[PDB]
Amino acid sequence: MKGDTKVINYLNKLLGNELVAINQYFLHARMFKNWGLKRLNDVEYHESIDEMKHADRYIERILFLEGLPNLQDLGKLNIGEDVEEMLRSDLALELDGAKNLREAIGYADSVHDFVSRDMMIEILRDEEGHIDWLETELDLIQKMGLQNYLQAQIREE
Amino acid sequence: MKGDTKVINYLNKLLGNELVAINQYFLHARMFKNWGLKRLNDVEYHESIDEMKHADRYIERILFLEGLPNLQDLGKLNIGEDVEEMLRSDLALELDGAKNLREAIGYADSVHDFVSRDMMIEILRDEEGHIDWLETELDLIQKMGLQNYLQAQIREE
Amino acid sequence: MKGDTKVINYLNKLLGNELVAINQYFLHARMFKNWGLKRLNDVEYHESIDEMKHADRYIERILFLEGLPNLQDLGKLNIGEDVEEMLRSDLALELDGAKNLREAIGYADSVHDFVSRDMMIEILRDEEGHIDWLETELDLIQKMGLQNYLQAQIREE
Amino acid sequence: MKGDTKVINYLNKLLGNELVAINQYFLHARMFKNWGLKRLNDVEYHESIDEMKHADRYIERILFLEGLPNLQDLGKLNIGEDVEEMLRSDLALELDGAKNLREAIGYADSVHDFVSRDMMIEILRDEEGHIDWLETELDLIQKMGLQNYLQAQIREE
Amino acid sequence: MKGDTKVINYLNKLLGNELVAINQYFLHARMFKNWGLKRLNDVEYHESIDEMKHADRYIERILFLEGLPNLQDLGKLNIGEDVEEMLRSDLALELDGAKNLREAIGYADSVHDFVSRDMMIEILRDEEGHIDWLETELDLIQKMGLQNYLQAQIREE
Amino acid sequence: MKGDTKVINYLNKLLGNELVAINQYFLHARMFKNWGLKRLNDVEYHESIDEMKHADRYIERILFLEGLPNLQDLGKLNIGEDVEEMLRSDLALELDGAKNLREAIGYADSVHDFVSRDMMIEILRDEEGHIDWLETELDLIQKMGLQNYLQAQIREE
Amino acid sequence: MKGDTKVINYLNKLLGNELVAINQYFLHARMFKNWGLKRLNDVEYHESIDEMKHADRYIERILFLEGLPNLQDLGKLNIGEDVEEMLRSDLALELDGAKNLREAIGYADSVHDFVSRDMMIEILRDEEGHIDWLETELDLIQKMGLQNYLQAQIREE
């Protein structure tokens, strides 16, 4: 079913955000795993999987709308080198992605693509959950100090 | 069964104490939850539920005694802005309510309302348990230091 | 994640509506229970629980958006003295709350807070369910007469 | 297998009767449901389903006999505005349908389409069951009075 | 609860679209069944059921809003005489109905009937799924040729 | 119980038809089995079994009515040499048998042997099902072509 | 444990190959899904998952060897526009990756990194399995023709 060209463009932009996050979350997860921070490996791995599900949804929606999903272009990752930098980079990426989502959701409504909008709102709700988790972890690092924080990650939850 | 007017007045005062505590414990729980202090969310949530049960018992008793339960007036909440402050506020509220319970229990005895007294004694035993828990947590904050204390709250027990 | 100030104000207003309804439904339920109208006790109790869930969602959303939930102010309850008067008062409260919800949902869309909007639409759906139930009960009182209506409430369903 | 032209015509006429009854029973059920008359929603819904099964049998028989099922033409519904009026309308429709069935059953026999006749006799037996139920309910409204009758419908049976 | 008159008119228009589709899908299903195309009978039958569910939701919503559901008027069926023709007709009907849904969804938003809107968005998501299925089947007829396509339908999947 | 002589004569004629069909269906089944067309073996074998059941019913009915079942005379088989020929021959036999059944059913009614008639109507319903199956397969051969049709028979259904 | 710099460089090159294949296989899978070719969706999806597992192994190995996994650079995808083109492109990518694996396996042996080598040989065995599958499907398209081939993909295996 032929979709709106700019809706497809938004879907590809958001798909692009998801592809960066999939890789960044996954690399962070395995960095945490290497360092023995099992709990952070588990959560970040889960976040990567969640972004994969989102990417899949964008891909299928774009195809249904008769557009071409773009998995070729990959945006900039910012890996970081310590736990705080890594989590802050994931947070910055989530915030940029949420801004893109809000713009796309408003636009989809205006051209009456209510199903694409509904999909995007569910994904945005997911992203805000990730934002909440990242903000909370960053605050905990400050509240309990980095040494206690790292200790609290070595066992799975 | 027409009850003693002053007993009903005490039950409404105690109901009022419970209504403040229900809201204060519940808000504290969700603040703790927001901050990632899962253990404190769990305990404060269950304390809110306990106070709800007490409130229900007062409402039912007042209605049996043919009085009018007052759920309209709400006493002063003191939320606090950090963990120690919030727990100290909960403890102060518990102590104030225990003072009112002791008065009411003595009075109900003087007018031979032994069933209302029996109900309030069970509720007071409940509140002294909350007092014990709050006192103990506050002591632990001082003994292990705030950073260790916060770390100990992030996993459910 | 810092939310829009007016959205947070709306959420607090709606939270306020839920807080009135929680108490009014709960007192109505126990009044019905006292009178032996078991069926009405069961329904109104479950409606009170439903509004508690809504209140919880508002409290959590407000805290996420870095606002301060207001559980201190409690709006006007209208208890009523007979079954029809009590149900009419619950209906009036539901209808006032639905108006507030519609205004907030429109505004959340305007400022692109689609996740707060999604939450409120779910809550509004729940509220219209309560309205449906209340309207239906009030019509039944008129159609079968009060004596038959009361007889119909003494067994749990 | 090429069927008799007038047998196919009768089947389409009967199918036409069932199509009206499907919609009228269904709308009646949901009207009853809206009014809180659960027992009447349940019965009328099941009657709508029964007529759907009959419609299915006619459609399949017409196609087997190489005719064209007519689902385009819809005869007159008579909804009515109160319980007695609605049930009387359903009864009138059943009685007209039964007349048509009797005529078709005699004709099918005359042209030796004994399998179409056998199908129609089973359907007619079903319809007379509905007529029995409707007559019984209408008599009950008169014997116990409308207020008692409505009270008897609020719980599923 | 007295609804918006124009929302009710849209709900009746959409209900009308559903009623045509219910009949058209069901007849197509049984035509496929008669031809031995079991897979196509199964899918089209379930699409008919899906449209019945949508019709039910519209009927219940309209009654809640104190309108009168129109099951009397039935729009034009376009049955068709061969598999491709039939599937194309179902697709054309889906596309017309989606256009009506988009219009109604936009309007309900303007009058703040967000629950009616939410219901219609879910139904639109369902219809776009049917559109996807129909488009895909039509393309398959072209890609594998009609003889292979028909062979692929004779066993249930 | 002494039956009507001409009813018994009809029952023997019908039994005769069944006896030819039992053999023709069984041989067809095993020819298809030899050819590797497992699906056709399965169905035709089942049809032979069905005709055995019918023959058993006629034999038992004739004996109850104090007549002599005739299993000695066997009418003409037309085996055919390819799938289409074989299926057409089964269809022609079914059609001839159905005309005989119709005559016998009308006659039984005229002499008030309603039990023999009832038995024959059930059997006729069964034969029309075989007719529907054969007509459908023959059409499928034409629509998908013989090569696809044969391919579709090699696996069991 | 500090690894050999050129081994890490090989591991990143191989990881790079896997990253292209993950995306190319996944997009191919969802294109096939959109087209109704369920069998090809299932297999290609599985191949994408397999390449994710390989990528995970490289990432973990690189980190153990104290290098930096490169998930930022993504090589050229060649999506293609029809089934044969898409499959040939997957085959070409697999063949390019296998040549890289062979080079890396020989090199790892020369610097005595036998564990990295062992990991890569297992992965190469997996890729040759994908190569066998793709070569086989491409031959089948030719042997049975595209129309039969597409028909064979519409059901899950």
Author numbering:
A (entry chain F), B (entry chain C), C (entry chain D), D (entry chain A), E (entry chain B), F (entry chain E), ...: 1 to 157
What does the literature reporting this entry say, word for word?
Ferritins are iron storage proteins that overcome the problems of toxicity and poor bioavailability of iron by catalyzing iron oxidation and mineralization through the activity of a diiron ferroxidase site. The capacity of cells to store iron in a bioavailable and safe form is a central feature of the strategy nature has evolved to overcome the dual problem of poor bioavailability of iron and the potential of the free metal to catalyze the formation of reactive radical species. This function is fulfilled by the ubiquitous ferritin family, members of which are composed of 24 subunits arranged to form a protein shell surrounding a hollow center. Bacterioferritins (BFRs) constitute a distinct sub-family of ferritins, found only in bacteria, which contain a markedly different diiron ferroxidase site. Unlike in other ferritins, the oxidized di-Fe3+ site of Escherichia coli bacterioferritin (EcBFR) is stable and therefore does not function as a conduit for the transfer of Fe3+ into the storage cavity, but instead acts as a true catalytic cofactor that cycles its oxidation state while driving Fe2+ oxidation in the cavity.
The EcBFR ferroxidase site is flanked by two Tyr residues (Tyr25 and Tyr58) that are ∼4.0–6.5 Å away from the nearest iron, and by a Trp residue (Trp133), which is ∼9.7 Å away from site FeB. BFR also contains five other Tyr and one other Trp, which are located further from the ferroxidase site. We sought to determine whether these aromatic residues are involved in coupling electron transfer to oxidation of Fe2+. Site-directed variants, in which each residue was substituted with Phe, were generated and the mineralization activity of the variant proteins was determined. Rates for the five other Tyr/Trp variants were 70 % (W35F, Y10F, Y107F), 75 % (Y114F) and 85 % (Y149F) that of wild type BFR. X-ray crystal structures were determined for the Y45F, Y114F, and Y149F variants. These, along with previously reported structures of W35F and W133F BFRs and Y25F and Y58F BFR subunit dimers, showed that the substitutions did not cause any significant changes beyond the substituted side chain. EPR studies of the EcBFR variants revealed that Tyr25 is the site of radical formation; only in Y25F was the Tyr radical not observed.
